[PDB]
Amino acid sequence: WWXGSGXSSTXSG
Amino acid sequence: EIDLSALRDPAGIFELVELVGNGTYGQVYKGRHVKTGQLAAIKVMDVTGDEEEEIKQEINMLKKYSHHRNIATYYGAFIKKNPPGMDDQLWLVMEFCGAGSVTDLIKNTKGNTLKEEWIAYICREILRGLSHLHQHKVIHRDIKGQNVLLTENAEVKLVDFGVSAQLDRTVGRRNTFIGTPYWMAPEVIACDENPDATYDFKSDLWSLGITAIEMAEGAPPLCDMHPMRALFLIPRNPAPRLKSKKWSKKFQSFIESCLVKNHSQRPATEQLMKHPFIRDQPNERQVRIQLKDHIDRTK
Ligand SMILES: Nc1ncnc2c1ncn2[C@@H]1O[C@H](CO)[C@@H](O)[C@H]1O
């Protein structure tokens, strides 16, 4: 949850 | 809107040589042009419908802005098309930055620190980079040492426009919780829980402060904490300062100007150029030749 977006929704909040 | 169909297969054009890293957890090789021999960084990704959002935006960003010498230039793209039981592999071809990242420079450097003149130089290059993007209504949204690259000649080139934001208007704000926790600004961290929370170009300028500190102390503030804690901390704690007082008064006031919690209070990019730490620089050639030699020693 601490990481926003990333490689196509990989942990996206 | 740019056509992905337009892109041909790269077999007989460019050739991969060796691994270099991943910013968006997509591989990056030291590409070589077959006929001429010229070097270029090639980011090999996997393209889907999940990804054709970042690929649309990012490419348009590079086509428009990469021309700037402070940003690694975009040469173009190729789609490597694989069998039905496989995934298509995008190639992004880019100005090769042969000295690697700032963060790697720091790690390979005795005591993981840089001479204050070096920090003030790299910061200026970045700031010129940001001022170019900010005037064009573009936010980088993930400024840090891993995304600041160095050429064999030690000129500073920004990379990774994957999580960048284009705005139609200059009055416009964003509300997307994004970037790297340690380097993230408070008004960005606010967008995690509260949907009313919005931010703008000011966010990058904070990330620069934290990068600046990264270059001094060898890592960002709160690096010894879990990211999810730094998150809770950054809004609550007093805006980070330098540890050592062996740095100059100007540098202390620079960091002190960058890292202002309230983004109303926080200066704009155009101002940060006018700051003593930036405005008055020993000489662009004087520091660069110097910094060139240290990279060239620490290869
Ligand atoms: N143009 C480039 N030249 C060299 N390495 C690059 C380039 N673009 C991206 N990278 C690699 O990807 C990482 C983050 O995008 C960098 O730290 C670096 O290792």
Author numbering:
A (entry chain B): 2 to 14
B (entry chain A): 12 to 310
Sentences from the paper on this structure:
To understand how densely functionalized thiopeptides interact with their target proteins, we solved the X-ray crystal structure of the TNIK·AMPPNP·wTP3 complex at 2.8 Å resolution. Like the previously identified TP1 and TP15 thiopeptides, wTP3 binds to the substrate binding site of TNIK. However, the binding mode of wTP3 deviates from those of TP1 and TP15.33 The peptide contacts both the N- and C-lobes of TNIK, interacting primarily with the αG-helix and P+1 loop in the C-terminal lobe. The N-lobe amino acids, Asp61-Glu62 in the αC-helix and Thr35-Tyr36 in the Gly-rich loop, additionally contact TicOH8-Dha9 residues in wTP3. The hydrogen bond between the side chain carboxylate of Glu62 and the amide nitrogen of Dha9 is the only polar contact in the interface, and the near absence of polar interactions between the protein and wTP3 is a striking feature of the structure. Instead, the high steric complementarity of wTP3 and TNIK appears to drive the association. Trp2, Trp3, and N-Me-Gly5 of wTP3 make numerous contacts with the exposed hydrophobic patch on the surface of TNIK. The carbonyl oxygen of Trp3 and the N-Me group of N-Me-Gly5 occupy the P+1 site, whereas the indole groups of Trp2 and Trp3 are stacked against the αG-helix residues, primarily His237, Pro238, Met239, and Leu242. Another notable feature of the structure is the intramolecular interactions and folding of wTP3. The pyridine-diazole moiety, the side chains of N-Me-Nph12, and Thr11 as well the phenol in TicOH8 are stacked on top of each other providing π–π and CH-π interactions which appear to rigidify and stabilize the peptide structure. wTP3 folds into a unique “quadruply twisted” conformation featuring two β-turns and two noncanonical turn elements organized without the use of intramolecular hydrogen bonds owing to the multiple nonproteinogenic elements in the structure.
Previously, we utilized this platform to identify a series of thiopeptides acting as potent and selective inhibitors of Traf2- and NCK-interacting kinase (TNIK), a protein implicated in several forms of cancer. However, the discovered thiopeptides featured random inserts composed predominantly of proteinogenic amino acids, which limited their likeness to natural products and led to modest metabolic stabilities. We demonstrate the feasibility of our designs by conducting affinity selections against Traf2- and NCK-interacting kinase (TNIK). An X-ray cocrystal structure of TNIK in complex with a discovered thiopeptide revealed how nonproteinogenic building blocks facilitate the target engagement and orchestrate the folding of the thiopeptide into a noncanonical conformation. X-ray structural analysis of the interaction between TNIK and one of the discovered thiopeptides, wTP3, pointed to a predominantly hydrophobic association driven by the steric complementarity between the protein and ligand.
